[PDB]
Amino acid sequence: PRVIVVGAGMSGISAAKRLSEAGITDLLILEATDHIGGRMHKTNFAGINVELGANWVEGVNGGKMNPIWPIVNSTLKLRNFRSDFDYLAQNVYKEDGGVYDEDYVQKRIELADSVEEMGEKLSATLHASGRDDMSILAMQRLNEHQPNGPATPVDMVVDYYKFDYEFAEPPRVTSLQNTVPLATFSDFGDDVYFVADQRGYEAVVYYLAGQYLKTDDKSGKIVDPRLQLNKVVREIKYSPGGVTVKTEDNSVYSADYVMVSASLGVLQSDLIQFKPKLPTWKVRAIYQFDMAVYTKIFLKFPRKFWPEGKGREFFLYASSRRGYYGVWQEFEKQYPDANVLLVTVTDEESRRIEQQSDEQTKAEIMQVLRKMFPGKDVPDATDILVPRWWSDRFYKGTFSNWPVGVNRYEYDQLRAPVGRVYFTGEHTSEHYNGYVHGAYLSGIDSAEILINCAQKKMC
Amino acid sequence: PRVIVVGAGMSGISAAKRLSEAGITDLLILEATDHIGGRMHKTNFAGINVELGANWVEGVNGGKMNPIWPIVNSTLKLRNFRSDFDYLAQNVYKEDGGVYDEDYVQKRIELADSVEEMGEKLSATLHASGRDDMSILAMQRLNEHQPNGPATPVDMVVDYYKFDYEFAEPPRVTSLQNTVPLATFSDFGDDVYFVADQRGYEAVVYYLAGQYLKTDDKSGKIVDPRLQLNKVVREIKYSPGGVTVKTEDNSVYSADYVMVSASLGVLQSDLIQFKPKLPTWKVRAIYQFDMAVYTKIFLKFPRKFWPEGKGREFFLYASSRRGYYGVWQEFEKQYPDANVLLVTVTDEESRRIEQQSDEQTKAEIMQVLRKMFPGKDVPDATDILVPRWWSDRFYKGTFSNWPVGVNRYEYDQLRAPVGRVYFTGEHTSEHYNGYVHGAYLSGIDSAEILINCAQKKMCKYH
Ligand SMILES: Cc1cc2nc3c(=O)[nH]c(=O)nc-3n(C[C@H](O)[C@H](O)[C@H](O)COP(=O)(O)OP(=O)(O)OC[C@H]3O[C@@H](n4cnc5c(N)ncnc54)[C@H](O)[C@@H]3O)c2cc1C
Ligand SMILES: Cc1cc2nc3c(=O)[nH]c(=O)nc-3n(C[C@H](O)[C@H](O)[C@H](O)COP(=O)(O)OP(=O)(O)OC[C@H]3O[C@@H](n4cnc5c(N)ncnc54)[C@H](O)[C@@H]3O)c2cc1C
Ligand SMILES: *[C@@H]1O[C@H](CO)[C@@H](O[C@@H]2O[C@H](CO)[C@@H](O)[C@H](O)[C@H]2NC(C)=O)[C@H](O)[C@H]1NC(C)=O
Ligand SMILES: *[C@@H]1O[C@H](CO)[C@@H](O[C@@H]2O[C@H](CO)[C@@H](O)[C@H](O)[C@H]2NC(C)=O)[C@H](O)[C@H]1NC(C)=O
Ligand SMILES: N=C(N)NCCCCCCCCNCCCCCCCCNC(=N)N
Ligand SMILES: N=C(N)NCCCCCCCCNCCCCCCCCNC(=N)N
């Protein structure tokens, strides 16, 4: 059967690969941008390549092997480093200047950890139907006996680093049952390794693609006509006998099936028109799940002024405004000579910042740093890079997040095909939504569902 | 039968009144503060009395009579004014100076209202269990076909005005099924009236209390000994046989039943100790519901520098930072010539603001005002009032909000009595949670449940 695959990010390339393996080689992969890899994407900033998107392989060293790991660490040997969060307590900056007392901070962190652990015990007792689910915030109130969760600047920044820095939305919006604990860590292990290689984390996608598409023997570039870039799908017509797909450049294609890998955010926009319209059950499941936004703002400076050394990699800024430029990282190991810093923001701050100029953002950031290092002469950053994933029509966000209120069944309707229209992507991952490994496994699972239906007539 | 009522806010007084009416007169009302009224309470600001808490009678001129309306508008004749929001599109300020084009703004408002009307149709069809609920935000995404809700400065302040200004938490956290549409409005009417009377909205509570508690001939002061002020209940012991209540000043009292009217926030803090400890199902129901915070920041100036006149009462500040000093009100009718402005904030901003000095908040507000009226010479406020309800241990917030995640059955567990312990208060109103009328009705309702048990020996709950 001929199958069209929309998008060449991790899940599409992974699905097309699994299909090829089942012998379905009459594939046509239509990618909107001029390159493959999607949300795994590097860029040159200040003379070095940095990740605009995914940057870590998360869940390593546990009882099960994360499928992405061996590819990164062994096959490609991409250069990487294990992240150590053990010293945060020495690195939390007061709004006004200097760090807080390490011991006071270590205790707040412990407290927050213990609450989360009680949350894990509670979560384990909820019903599968999801009828007792609650937000993480609700769990925090219950466990600490208060009418509110973390509320002082220090408590809030710890709360942010613990939850928003991972999920990109606050605990109060997040489903407890479906995030605490996270399978990723539960199955694959607690460690995370930051990929810092000039070839880019995306190299993992290129490697997979190359196992089945044709590439130039000199170039190594993919040259298989089954892959077509700069193809923006804008309409998908389907019927019980097949599908027709139309691109923005006016091409029209026909196939037996279509496998849609665009992000949940793309699905929640009107970029692709379905004809007929998708059924209400499908539409509702789409709009109920969240497409979150995580913005990695890189900054380059004329010289260093922050600390470097053991436990110095990660540091927090405890603003009285929750989530305001709060999570910092310095790359003494990764980009040794650079003078680069990375501050991460999400959600509301991300949408606000995407909507303003880089210069305006640089100026806000400069005020924060000077507040943090009142004792130093802080030079203005020379360059800044603000990724605009929510504004990008091909992504509309960075990764899904499971909101309180959505149960497994509705989550499942997200993965559900509609006649011959199949779906894949990180938001369709049964237990690893949000992650690279989840996009990867989702491609395989989606492809297998299509295979059984198409090939064995078992749908 | 002897009953102790904890709290002399609207619901406790209301409940006591109903028990009194059923002939249950061996009552003891224990009030933490030195006064009655609870969340209805005025204060002197710059020479005038302003309401720190409730300020409107919401839901008027509809199909049914809001029980509070007649007391306010007729029985007591408290000075009041219908609020008119028809001219908002002419009063939305740019983060950086002046207002937006009215036509541009009205279109955005109409769009927002339409999404909401679509939301009400969806809400009517959802399963009664609440198991199919979703946040207001999910509904917005669905109807706008976007991966986010209102996200530009104008759209965001309109959203906040439409939702946070009523509920005190964002749409994304709020239950659609339970707030859109709102019964208060469907049943009693779309209008709202702002009470601006020197005796305060709390006069309604004093009036009811007076219908059954003893007052002095010219004091008019209640002096019935069944009302004890300055009595903080810190412990409630209950058994098949009865109940014992202990206050902070060591007083101890016994009764056949106790009716607890303290806010949801008080319940979530652990001010009152229950012995034995409340059952888990009850504890969970208590922690799951939300206690919101709505902060009325009053400001006094040496001169006016803002517009007054038709459609001038309400104005918005379209900050690129959601919820940032966004909803303003001028008092040309209520406090003529007093030069006072009221800016309202909630939720995250409320908590931040309660934790810093009033001087710092005033300076933040001065900066906003000067960006708003750049061609004027904006004098610094000479006085500011920042109510701190969340920090007050007898309140711990302003009013409940129904969050996505709490279902019908869970809400009933929140209301449910435990042995001889009954609960009441706005958070126990099934259809009017959060409101003064909801408090008032919840009092009569809890009382009746108790009356059935006591007087008719009908003691099973649901
Ligand atoms: C800022 C950021 C930080 C992250 N951090 C990490 C991390 O450190 N670790 C981790 O495990 N995960 C992380 N993630 C998540 C991870 O990158 C994703 O889970 C994964 O890459 C998504 O793969 P996908 O195939 O589902 O989606 P995508 O990668 O979005 O692939 C979909 C593709 O479809 C294309 N497309 C869209 N619309 C159309 C159209 N109309 N026609 C044709 N093609 C179209 C897109 O261009 C894209 O190539 C991060 C992501 C981001 C963006
Ligand atoms: C800022 C604000 C704005 C609002 N705006 C409006 C509005 O405009 N219109 C409207 O309809 N509603 C509004 N409300 C909501 C309204 O005020 C409430 O719904 C209602 O007043 C609550 O009454 P209640 O009896 O349930 O609780 P409360 O008034 O809290 O009564 C409980 C009483 O118990 C006392 N108490 C507490 N703990 C103890 C203890 N341990 N022992 C003894 N006594 C104790 C408290 O002091 C209080 O007197 C607002 C409230 C606030 C605070
Ligand atoms: C990731 O890959 C490196 C690459 O080898 C691992 O480091 C080696 O492990 C073998 C196994 O015995 C040793 O004999 C080599 O000497 C090690 N190399 C180095 C440079 O130490 C590493 O352990 C891998 N990490 C994970 C998490 O799998
Ligand atoms: C609020 O109360 C005032 C007080 O009476 C109402 O105004 C009266 O309404 C009756 C009804 O026709 C008239 O006969 C009186 O002449 C009115 N009095 C005045 C002073 O105008 C008013 O209509 C009430 N508002 C609401 C919403 O009930
Ligand atoms: N929990 C641990 N054992 N450790 C976690 C260590 C923190 C790692 C810091 C990395 C910075 C976070 N980058 C996260 C991006 C990953 C996308 C995942 C979204 C998952 C959301 N999932 C659900 N909502 N169910
Ligand atoms: N919906 C209308 N027809 N109009 C409403 C007009 C807006 C009124 C503006 C007055 C300012 C808001 N004061 C609100 C305080 C009231 C407390 C009640 C909270 C409601 C909680 N309800 C639920 N979450 N279910």
PDB file of C-alpha atoms in Angstrom, chain B residues 128-254:
ATOM      1  CA  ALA B 128     -23.932  15.208  35.454  1.00  0.00           C
ATOM      2  CA  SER B 129     -21.265  13.354  37.324  1.00  0.00           C
ATOM      3  CA  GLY B 130     -18.773  16.041  36.197  1.00  0.00           C
ATOM      4  CA  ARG B 131     -16.704  13.278  34.871  1.00  0.00           C
ATOM      5  CA  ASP B 132     -16.585  14.865  31.450  1.00  0.00           C
ATOM      6  CA  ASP B 133     -15.636  18.313  32.734  1.00  0.00           C
ATOM      7  CA  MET B 134     -12.802  20.416  31.267  1.00  0.00           C
ATOM      8  CA  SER B 135     -11.323  23.821  32.119  1.00  0.00           C
ATOM      9  CA  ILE B 136     -12.747  26.970  30.652  1.00  0.00           C
ATOM     10  CA  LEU B 137      -9.477  27.250  28.756  1.00  0.00           C
ATOM     11  CA  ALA B 138      -9.924  23.871  26.990  1.00  0.00           C
ATOM     12  CA  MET B 139     -13.332  25.078  25.845  1.00  0.00           C
ATOM     13  CA  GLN B 140     -11.802  28.264  24.537  1.00  0.00           C
ATOM     14  CA  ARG B 141      -9.143  26.381  22.549  1.00  0.00           C
ATOM     15  CA  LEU B 142     -11.789  24.116  21.105  1.00  0.00           C
ATOM     16  CA  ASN B 143     -13.945  26.981  19.971  1.00  0.00           C
ATOM     17  CA  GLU B 144     -11.196  29.174  18.699  1.00  0.00           C
ATOM     18  CA  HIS B 145      -9.212  26.326  17.103  1.00  0.00           C
ATOM     19  CA  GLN B 146      -5.949  27.457  18.604  1.00  0.00           C
ATOM     20  CA  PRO B 147      -3.330  25.842  20.830  1.00  0.00           C
ATOM     21  CA  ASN B 148      -3.863  28.601  23.365  1.00  0.00           C
ATOM     22  CA  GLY B 149      -6.470  30.939  24.816  1.00  0.00           C
ATOM     23  CA  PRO B 150      -6.438  34.756  24.565  1.00  0.00           C
ATOM     24  CA  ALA B 151      -2.738  35.668  24.331  1.00  0.00           C
ATOM     25  CA  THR B 152      -2.356  39.263  23.139  1.00  0.00           C
ATOM     26  CA  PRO B 153      -2.485  42.141  25.616  1.00  0.00           C
ATOM     27  CA  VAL B 154      -5.973  43.249  24.688  1.00  0.00           C
ATOM     28  CA  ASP B 155      -7.415  39.794  24.454  1.00  0.00           C
ATOM     29  CA  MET B 156      -5.843  38.836  27.722  1.00  0.00           C
ATOM     30  CA  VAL B 157      -7.187  41.746  29.763  1.00  0.00           C
ATOM     31  CA  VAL B 158     -10.632  41.103  28.248  1.00  0.00           C
ATOM     32  CA  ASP B 159     -10.381  37.443  29.314  1.00  0.00           C
ATOM     33  CA  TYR B 160      -9.300  38.445  32.776  1.00  0.00           C
ATOM     34  CA  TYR B 161     -12.095  40.892  33.005  1.00  0.00           C
ATOM     35  CA  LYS B 162     -14.531  38.275  31.882  1.00  0.00           C
ATOM     36  CA  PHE B 163     -13.313  35.465  34.128  1.00  0.00           C
ATOM     37  CA  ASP B 164     -10.609  36.193  36.771  1.00  0.00           C
ATOM     38  CA  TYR B 165     -12.494  39.373  37.785  1.00  0.00           C
ATOM     39  CA  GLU B 166     -15.422  37.196  38.791  1.00  0.00           C
ATOM     40  CA  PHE B 167     -13.768  33.937  39.963  1.00  0.00           C
ATOM     41  CA  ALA B 168     -10.347  35.041  41.104  1.00  0.00           C
ATOM     42  CA  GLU B 169      -8.364  32.278  39.310  1.00  0.00           C
ATOM     43  CA  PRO B 170      -7.670  31.751  35.607  1.00  0.00           C
ATOM     44  CA  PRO B 171      -9.985  29.981  33.198  1.00  0.00           C
ATOM     45  CA  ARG B 172      -7.446  27.219  32.775  1.00  0.00           C
ATOM     46  CA  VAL B 173      -7.852  26.270  36.328  1.00  0.00           C
ATOM     47  CA  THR B 174     -11.605  26.688  36.444  1.00  0.00           C
ATOM     48  CA  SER B 175     -14.383  24.081  35.940  1.00  0.00           C
ATOM     49  CA  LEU B 176     -16.443  24.875  32.789  1.00  0.00           C
ATOM     50  CA  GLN B 177     -19.425  22.778  33.817  1.00  0.00           C
ATOM     51  CA  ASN B 178     -19.700  24.661  37.061  1.00  0.00           C
ATOM     52  CA  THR B 179     -19.227  28.225  35.996  1.00  0.00           C
ATOM     53  CA  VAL B 180     -20.449  28.627  32.472  1.00  0.00           C
ATOM     54  CA  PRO B 181     -23.169  29.539  32.683  1.00  0.00           C
ATOM     55  CA  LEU B 182     -23.436  30.737  36.269  1.00  0.00           C
ATOM     56  CA  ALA B 183     -26.729  30.043  38.100  1.00  0.00           C
ATOM     57  CA  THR B 184     -26.611  33.302  40.006  1.00  0.00           C
ATOM     58  CA  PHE B 185     -27.065  35.088  36.685  1.00  0.00           C
ATOM     59  CA  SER B 186     -29.382  32.603  35.036  1.00  0.00           C
ATOM     60  CA  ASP B 187     -31.693  32.575  38.019  1.00  0.00           C
ATOM     61  CA  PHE B 188     -31.664  36.045  39.487  1.00  0.00           C
ATOM     62  CA  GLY B 189     -30.644  38.286  36.647  1.00  0.00           C
ATOM     63  CA  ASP B 190     -27.759  39.738  34.685  1.00  0.00           C
ATOM     64  CA  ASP B 191     -27.455  42.878  36.681  1.00  0.00           C
ATOM     65  CA  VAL B 192     -25.216  43.709  39.597  1.00  0.00           C
ATOM     66  CA  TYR B 193     -25.467  46.552  42.066  1.00  0.00           C
ATOM     67  CA  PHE B 194     -22.553  48.102  43.904  1.00  0.00           C
ATOM     68  CA  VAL B 195     -23.317  48.966  47.524  1.00  0.00           C
ATOM     69  CA  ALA B 196     -21.680  52.299  48.572  1.00  0.00           C
ATOM     70  CA  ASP B 197     -23.225  53.105  51.928  1.00  0.00           C
ATOM     71  CA  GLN B 198     -21.507  54.233  55.096  1.00  0.00           C
ATOM     72  CA  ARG B 199     -23.202  51.584  57.119  1.00  0.00           C
ATOM     73  CA  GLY B 200     -21.710  48.903  54.836  1.00  0.00           C
ATOM     74  CA  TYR B 201     -23.038  45.811  53.047  1.00  0.00           C
ATOM     75  CA  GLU B 202     -22.529  44.033  56.426  1.00  0.00           C
ATOM     76  CA  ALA B 203     -25.629  45.920  57.634  1.00  0.00           C
ATOM     77  CA  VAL B 204     -27.477  43.066  55.956  1.00  0.00           C
ATOM     78  CA  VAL B 205     -25.903  40.646  58.423  1.00  0.00           C
ATOM     79  CA  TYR B 206     -26.597  42.916  61.398  1.00  0.00           C
ATOM     80  CA  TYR B 207     -30.235  43.152  60.268  1.00  0.00           C
ATOM     81  CA  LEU B 208     -30.772  39.435  60.158  1.00  0.00           C
ATOM     82  CA  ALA B 209     -29.047  38.852  63.452  1.00  0.00           C
ATOM     83  CA  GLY B 210     -31.377  41.397  64.966  1.00  0.00           C
ATOM     84  CA  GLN B 211     -34.396  39.426  63.761  1.00  0.00           C
ATOM     85  CA  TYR B 212     -33.687  36.931  66.503  1.00  0.00           C
ATOM     86  CA  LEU B 213     -30.910  37.931  68.854  1.00  0.00           C
ATOM     87  CA  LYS B 214     -31.404  40.498  71.595  1.00  0.00           C
ATOM     88  CA  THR B 215     -30.274  44.089  70.986  1.00  0.00           C
ATOM     89  CA  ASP B 216     -30.267  47.173  73.152  1.00  0.00           C
ATOM     90  CA  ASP B 217     -33.023  49.745  72.890  1.00  0.00           C
ATOM     91  CA  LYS B 218     -30.807  52.622  71.923  1.00  0.00           C
ATOM     92  CA  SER B 219     -27.676  50.698  71.445  1.00  0.00           C
ATOM     93  CA  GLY B 220     -29.345  48.726  68.710  1.00  0.00           C
ATOM     94  CA  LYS B 221     -26.237  46.788  69.667  1.00  0.00           C
ATOM     95  CA  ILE B 222     -26.785  43.121  69.879  1.00  0.00           C
ATOM     96  CA  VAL B 223     -26.409  42.099  73.503  1.00  0.00           C
ATOM     97  CA  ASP B 224     -27.906  38.680  73.409  1.00  0.00           C
ATOM     98  CA  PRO B 225     -25.607  36.417  75.334  1.00  0.00           C
ATOM     99  CA  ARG B 226     -26.050  33.647  72.740  1.00  0.00           C
ATOM    100  CA  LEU B 227     -23.587  35.569  70.599  1.00  0.00           C
ATOM    101  CA  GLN B 228     -20.023  35.497  71.940  1.00  0.00           C
ATOM    102  CA  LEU B 229     -17.412  37.553  70.083  1.00  0.00           C
ATOM    103  CA  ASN B 230     -13.669  37.140  70.423  1.00  0.00           C
ATOM    104  CA  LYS B 231     -14.033  33.426  70.718  1.00  0.00           C
ATOM    105  CA  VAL B 232     -11.735  31.424  68.464  1.00  0.00           C
ATOM    106  CA  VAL B 233     -12.740  27.801  68.205  1.00  0.00           C
ATOM    107  CA  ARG B 234      -9.590  25.680  68.147  1.00  0.00           C
ATOM    108  CA  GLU B 235     -11.006  22.273  68.769  1.00  0.00           C
ATOM    109  CA  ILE B 236     -14.168  20.268  68.146  1.00  0.00           C
ATOM    110  CA  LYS B 237     -14.587  16.875  69.794  1.00  0.00           C
ATOM    111  CA  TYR B 238     -17.638  14.903  68.653  1.00  0.00           C
ATOM    112  CA  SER B 239     -19.275  11.623  69.573  1.00  0.00           C
ATOM    113  CA  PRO B 240     -22.493   9.619  69.148  1.00  0.00           C
ATOM    114  CA  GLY B 241     -23.629  11.360  72.209  1.00  0.00           C
ATOM    115  CA  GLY B 242     -22.715  14.929  71.560  1.00  0.00           C
ATOM    116  CA  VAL B 243     -20.117  17.522  70.940  1.00  0.00           C
ATOM    117  CA  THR B 244     -17.545  19.588  72.838  1.00  0.00           C
ATOM    118  CA  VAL B 245     -16.059  22.780  71.598  1.00  0.00           C
ATOM    119  CA  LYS B 246     -12.970  24.573  72.979  1.00  0.00           C
ATOM    120  CA  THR B 247     -11.783  28.083  72.260  1.00  0.00           C
ATOM    121  CA  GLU B 248      -8.344  29.636  72.389  1.00  0.00           C
ATOM    122  CA  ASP B 249      -9.075  31.433  75.594  1.00  0.00           C
ATOM    123  CA  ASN B 250      -9.742  28.053  77.092  1.00  0.00           C
ATOM    124  CA  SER B 251     -13.561  28.222  77.166  1.00  0.00           C
ATOM    125  CA  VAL B 252     -15.283  24.910  76.821  1.00  0.00           C
ATOM    126  CA  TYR B 253     -18.853  24.294  75.720  1.00  0.00           C
ATOM    127  CA  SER B 254     -21.125  21.314  75.090  1.00  0.00           C
TER     128      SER B 254
END
